[PDB]
Design a binder for this molecule. Structure first.
Ligand SMILES: COCC(=O)N[C@@H](Cc1ccc(-c2cc(Cl)cc(Cl)c2)cc1)[C@H](O)[C@@H](O)C(=O)O
Lengths: 188, 78
């Protein structure tokens, strides 16, 4: 009675709830709807995001995993690699282009062997490593570059990170979540 | 200072590496190239949410015996 995409989603959900990616907690937005997942994301210790509690939604198409999901932060994140609408800018969330001149590898575009665990690890990489040559958010990219070039003396970018981390405290308290602040707590 | 660490790949395999706590990330990436063929500048190693920087050491990140790292490839195209 479950469709092929429902069966695929059930398998991935079970895997990510029983063997989670550290710092990521996965649940269904609606109990009966396998196609919309809530992702709660802790800022890692020993980063400027430490103490943050961020939320994204993953929305899956009717034909998953033959087509990619979307991955969108609900409250927006000011970051060179995140679009202002909340979408993360990752090549794997789009189908292959079937152009031998493009030089793209299969691992860089969506295919039915890709999965949510790979998306989450890609999101960690994207958060760690701004691409200022091809930014999703130009104004955040320009600000990040000024912050990096000034060795933090132009504090604006870090001030925005601090403000966006602080804004998550109310949501954490509502969910009764204690954000980890040490390596031991994050890796539990 | 010798220890074993585990490197999880996107294909679902675990690489067990023999390392020293004083080894640089560069040294670890060289070992991964020898085992998997992936050029070091394309490798990204993740530990507790952080991508590890080439010139630092495992001990700089408090990576201890039997730690698990995640290997991904650098994201292309932005
Ligand atoms: C931008 O500069 C501030 C900053 O904290 N940069 C970190 C990168 C970084 C690491 C993790 C995330 C990250 C990871 C996850 Cl899984 C979630 C979130 Cl919200 C952020 C973002 C950046 C660096 O590792 C920094 O600690 C450092 O030690 O050099």
């Amino acid at each position: 009675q479950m469709t092929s995409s429902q069966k695929a989603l059930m398998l991935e959900l079970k895997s990510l709830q029983e063997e989670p990616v550290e710092g990521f907690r996965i649940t269904l937005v609606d109990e009966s709807d396998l196609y919309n997942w809530e992702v709660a994301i802790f800022g890692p210790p020993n980063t400027l995001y430490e103490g943050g509690y961020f939320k994204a939604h993953i929305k899956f198409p009717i034909d998953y995993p033959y087509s990619p999901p979307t991955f969108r932060f609900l409250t927006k994140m000011w970051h060179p690699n995140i679009y202002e609408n909340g979408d993360v800018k990752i090549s794997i969330l789009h189908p292959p282009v079937d152009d031998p001149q493009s030089g793209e590898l299969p691992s860089e575009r969506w295919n039915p062997t890709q999965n949510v665990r790979t998306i989450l690890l890609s999101v960690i990489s994207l958060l760690n490593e701004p691409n200022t040559f091809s930014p999703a958010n130009v104004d955040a990219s320009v600000m990040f570059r000024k912050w990096r070039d000034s060795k933090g003396k132009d504090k604006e970018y870090a001030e925005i990170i601090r403000k966006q981390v602080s804004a998550t405290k109310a949501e954490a308290e509502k969910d009764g979540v204690k954000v980890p602040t040490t390596l031991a707590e994050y890796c539990i | 200072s010798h220890m074993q660490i585990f490197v999880k790949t996107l294909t679902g395999k675990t690489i067990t590496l023999e390392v020293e706590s004083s080894d640089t990330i560069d040294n670890v990436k060289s070992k991964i190239q020898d085992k998997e063929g992936i050029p070091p500048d394309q490798q990204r190693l993740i530990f507790a949410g952080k991508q590890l920087e080439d010139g630092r050491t495992l001990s700089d990140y408090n990576i201890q015996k039997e730690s698990t790292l995640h290997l991904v490839l650098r994201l292309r195209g932005g």
